[PDB]
Design a protein around this ligand. Structure first.
Ligand SMILES: *C(=O)[C@H]([C@@H](C)O)[C@H]1CC(SCCNC=N)=C(C(=O)O)N1
Ligand SMILES: *C(=O)[C@H]([C@@H](C)O)[C@H]1CC(SCCNC=N)=C(C(=O)O)N1
Lengths: 234, 237
């Protein structure tokens, strides 16, 4: 029962941005968004796919453990933060089609369509996922409810930490498919969750982008909205 | 074999502080300190004991899991919240439920300092006879980092996560402060800052302690080691 919040539209209007922001408190049953419609629309996950991929990589053994080093050398958190294109293409290849499919089914990940090439389906393949689905997936991860060891889920959760403050911890992941065209604009993402006190907020944001100079709005807009809600005040 | 960096003492002299800093790269086999004599000297762990206490509490089931919540009425605290503030009673309760025997066994497995928990199961680390050196702190944190402690990998990961205090694109700082109090003329209190930095594919373990007889100096337990590590290029100034 996701409710809409017209107030948050102001932040998009201020920048002339077409996109959506989904923010949920405590669980995926209490969400709000500036565009209930786009909230359920499915888009290429791009780099946000690094989250389920890292979990699957660990679960299948492709990634030895939390201390696994990757030659472009990068740590798991380092590889998650940068493009590190070769790293995750290699992880995907090692996992393979059959195992990848099995896990996305277990994870209920978007349309679960990995067609387009084992080492690129999330960047230029048929995979698509919505902001609402991203939140449901991140919630399962937070609760250690994904079909993977709690050990591996915890490893990825710490690898996703991007901001630390005395009162909260922000876990997040960016994503960007590429400029594209007006008849088919690219999509930029920012998803994650904030642990503030004993409370938790899950969020998913995506926006049409036709110029890379608009990329910073992908983080600024959601940060402003969450800052107002007194969640991070960044 | 720990080496002694004389230049580090200038950071202590600048604030007229008596203390020690132990910093190691990759492992405890590559450590440096401003004073070999004090690096091995055991001191009251104070709040730094919350680290093994948290692991033991989780390993014994006393602490349900990572989502365990703890208790003018102040709202409940998360594991991370409880670790960062005083919340001494929270950990006193944990210690009581763990019990003398189990605590003793775990500190033995953890090779935690002098392993002397006598004189009150709920306060041996705050005023008891328990003592641990900066080098021992590093060894302990190293074991935690490698998941080599006698506890589930899961629980070690939960505690390591709860210890995150600074996040930058290039590094993650895990740390824990400590403060026994101001003590007295003949015996001042001790202040600590221990933890480790994951920078890229490298890891740096650190343990700092200083004598302190006035809370006015507390900020120094973080600033002195931060200056030293910042100078070494490990973390931002
Ligand atoms: C993930 O969605 C993309 C890419 C791997 O497809 C990465 C790269 C970028 S922006 C490009 C700059 N690369 C550095 N030289 C992002 C992003 O979303 O900002 N994620
Ligand atoms: C842990 O060792 C101490 C205490 C429980 O003994 C706690 C409380 C503090 S500082 C208390 C207020 N000081 C004011 N300037 C710390 C700490 O060292 O940060 N941990």
């Amino acid at each position: 029962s996701i409710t809409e919040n017209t107030s948050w539209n102001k932040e998009f209007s201020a920048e002339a941005v077409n996109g959506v922001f989904v923010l949920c408190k405590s669980s995926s049953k209490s969400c709000a968004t500036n565009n209930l419609a786009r909230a359920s629309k499915e888009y290429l996950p791009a780099s946000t796919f690094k989250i389920p991929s890292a979990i699957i990589g660990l679960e299948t053994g492709v990634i030895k453990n939390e201390h696994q080093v990757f030659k472009w050398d990068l740590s798991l958190r380092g590889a998650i933060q940068v493009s590190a294109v070769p790293v995750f293409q290699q992880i995907a290849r090692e996992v393979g089609e059959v195992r990848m499919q099995k896990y996305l089914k277990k994870f209920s990940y978007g349309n679960q369509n990995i067609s387009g090439g084992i080492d690129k389906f999330w960047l230029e393949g048929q995979l698509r996922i919505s902001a609402v689905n991203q939140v449901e997936f991140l919630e399962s991860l937070f609760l250690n409810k994904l079909s993977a060891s709690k050990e591996n889920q915890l490893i990825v959760k710490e690898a996703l930490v991007t901001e630390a403050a005395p009162e909260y911890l922000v876990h997040s992941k960016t994503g960007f498919s590429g400029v594209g065209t007006e008849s088919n604009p690219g999509v930029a993402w920012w998803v994650g969750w904030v642990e503030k006190g004993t409370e938790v907020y899950f969020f998913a944001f995506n926006m049409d982008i036709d110029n890379e100079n608009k990329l910073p709005l992908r983080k600024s807009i959601p940060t402003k909205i969450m800052a107002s809600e007194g969640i991070i005040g960044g």
